[PDB]
């Protein structure tokens, strides 16, 4: 079914560091999902609260 | 105390932390049981039929509020009273609710945000999210201001939003939800013309004070709901009552018996310990324009600089460096030789490997040794990477003290996570002052569990956190324990200088149990466990004392030209005699350096008249 | 441009200067053509048939007001808006009108204060002053403060020969004269419980701002009648806008664009040059004892001492210094060449003779050497003679700085008049800062005509004056003229040591 | 008949300096009469403005 997300547009590829990228269409913005144990708007900071 | 427990607020613009079930957890443990969330209120990625009855208490949000991609039908975010909007999502809006529906078209249903009254800054954006009902008829000019009212972009359209109409007891059919309760409590367009701020009822007789923000319970600065600028023991003042009042009948500054210190939107009797106390009575975190700080008997002030004073750089995320989020090889040409970083230090594994997303070159791993000059760090120190050669933290060799004013994630001032370094090597590190320390996720790093961090901290209440690094039972196997000299007070590493207090004698930094004295070849002497070098002009002793002073005047045993009490390699060869005359001293019957008859004003270099040609 | 001319206001409580014509003729100079009185208001002994035209323009008296022992038809003290009450009379009163009748019982029949709104401090006492009426029924709670209502007493009484009533239209006949124009404007009791300060009209849609002290002209922080506390450019503020604003998010302090240096109940863009600015902009006269006055970058400052602060001597007239008016023989010991006299130097021909009514022994002249090298005096110097053997100002020798904080009579700093001293001296005084220097009453004193005071004080806008001294042709062929080898710079004395 | 001015009570003998002292009956407080060229509460200062 039609979802929000199309694959990362390669305009902002390798956008985040510790996570997988995905581009949503409901605003034309990239918003990636981090790996486990990370935070941040670019999945850059390490989760220290564990 | 009586105050309200605070969260720290998320800062994930649009980001899924793991999966729909892991993300829901990073919400819960972050936003459970708190009332004054201090950074933001992202409620994002909740999925259908996930309980959210813990948002019934957030009574302030000192930052924007993002509700985006939420599929639960009901978000109980009711008791929220004011969104101070210190920082805007999308750099304009301060309450965004956008695209809250899945593929099946069953997205957000109702936002019973009843008691939301005032937004101190910023517009409000809304976007496609059907099943959202009743909010399409709220009155905005009451909630928001008037100038910022030209940026909002609300856009309501729903299909299954068959939600019933709101009860007729409330104006213009304006309502958050359904029932008599959910209907827009008006307090800023029903005011009487003579009123300037908040009110209640068109009666010009029961307005609110000038500083209340939501509402009031009587016109008074003591009966507001939420204060607009400052507050001191239930009083929404506009500026903390200063310390010294002016007396125009005598022109001399009096003393205010109610002088309080303005510390970040509250008036306090005394600033905290690690905070500067300036002259205006306002607690600061970093006060340098031309001047610098210095100790004043337990309370740090920052007096004036005498022209040329030492350098200071700006931290990460402050002033210049804000579009950058680490220290990469385009914002390192600033930390050239500054000895104190006003701010905070990030080292993420983006600088070394570089990245093209923000136009950063791949920083050479050697440029990092510039930071050898850093001594005091105001904020926190976060490290999660290091060049793939170094074995101990080298560039931070002589870090004196970590002030820890602003702490990463709210508790961690020092944080070294996911590193490959045999052992720390931070050897100076006097007095980590506030905030906790986390050193984990390290592959091969073991010594650090030996130090006594209970003494290293500053303000008590701290707590260390050291797990998930190379086991002690594996470093003792390879014998990676510290030098036998170091006292039972810790050892940052295996090199015999990494101790913190040597066994018996110390060479300033390097440890030696028995330095050289009455037996021993190098000429030096001990002084309160410090091996200091006496003047080398003396002769190597074997029986009695060498000396007790740095100068040679105590070199008793000497095999050179003995300058009376002193002893030098040759008797003085250019010292001035009387009345600014150059005089070469000669040797007496004991080879001593002594003067002669004042007759021969050009010195006395001979026995009698054989050195003054007659 | 919107400023108002200012009077200084006398302080001679009940004494009369000379005769009833001279007294009045001095009372014609002081108070002629001015709105605000920066001092006190004494009007006493203006006898009958004398005119009081000028006395209507007075708009505010920043002290107390005394109307006693005068017998005249009326006192057209009409537009007096407010009486601050900074000082007081009898330590409790701010307006007192006592005993306005002579033998003829003609007295004062009408005190027309139509629009006196508020007395900011202290009680008010109308002692027995017959032949006065139409001021015997005003409601006083409207003008006096709340607590000071207990500290007052009215002794109004009159034989009441005529004294008609006024128009019954104005509230409870509480008028100060004839008609409604001369009737009270009571704007503190007829207000709504929704207003806390003054108001105008019973309605709560127009009640005055919480800072205006008399009335209002469209409720706002500006447009008051008289500012109660401070004033910054036609706005009755409560504290001048500071220069540094504590940004409660970044914990720093920001430069405020509207910086206002507080300066004695008015906010000004920059303190006067001879004033020492503290850290947060506010003019002050003498920095606190913890600090020492250091000058840097033009205008002066004051920072903490290096331990043992130098001794400062506060002049007579401030602090505990009111049980004595000049430096009598019970205070000289409290001076040890401070070099930094702060404010006054009150040395009058009254110490040397002593007086018993004030419980003082006669001063001996030998102990006037403590002031041998007083380097700087901030405010002003008041001398009128010496012990008549010393033939020059021998104590004040190394004095150099006269800055002018508390100028005498608001117009004078170096006051040396009425002595018999051949050459005054002052071999080292080179730093007059403000005020005026006056040497006009010495029978035998003929060197002060030579100095070019233009270089004595900067801050152009001052003018000295020298009269009634030995004519230049008198002491020319006498032995007292500027020295021969001396330089064309003036002769503070006859010799080369003072050629400067 | 009401001699509003009576002579200085001699309890304040030479109360003021530069002018005759004289007392009052209705208020019981003296009002010195300063000479010409003198001002002040007890005739202290020389009139410097004049």
Author numbering:
A (entry chain C), D (entry chain D): 1 to 50
B (entry chain A): 1 to 614
C (entry chain B): 1 to 500
Sentences from the paper on this structure:
The epidermal growth factor receptor (EGFR) is a receptor tyrosine kinase that couples the binding of extracellular ligands, such as EGF and transforming growth factor-α (TGF-α), to the initiation of intracellular signaling pathways. The extracellular module of EGFR consists of four domains, denoted Domains I, II, III, and IV. Domain II, which bridges the ligand-binding domains, contains the ‘dimerization arm’, a loop that mediates the principal interaction with the other subunit in an activated dimer. Domains I, II, and III form a compact unit that we refer to as the ligand-binding ‘head’, and Domain IV forms a rigid and elongated ‘leg’ that connects the ligand-binding head to the single transmembrane helix.
We carried out cryo-EM analysis of EGFR bound to TGF-α using the same procedures as before. Compared to the EGFR:EGF complex, the flexible leg in the tips-separated conformation of the EGFR:TGF-α complex is destabilized. Several key interactions with Domain I of the receptor are different between EGF and TGF-α. As a result, the ligand-binding pocket is slightly compressed when TGF-α is bound. In the simulations of EGFR bound to TGF-α, this angle is slightly smaller, with the mode occurring at ~75°, indicating that the ligand-binding pocket is slightly compressed when EGFR is bound to TGF-α. This compression between Domains I and III causes Domain II to bend in the TGF-α complex relative to its structure in the EGF complex, leading to a small difference in the orientation of the dimerization arm with respect to Domains III and IV. EGF and TGF-α both maintain the same interface between the dimerization arms of the two EGFR subunits in the dimer, but the additional bending of Domain II in the TGF-α complex requires the two Domain IV legs to rotate toward each other. In the tips-separated conformation of the TGF-α complex, this inward motion would cause a steric clash between the two legs if the legs maintained the conformation seen in the EGF complex. The increased disorder in the Domain IV leg when TGF-α is bound appears to be a result of this close contact being avoided. Due to the more compressed ligand-binding pocket in the TGF-α complex, which leads to potential steric clashes between the Domain IV legs, TGF-α is less effective than EGF at stabilizing the Domain IV legs in the tips-separated conformation of the extracellular module.
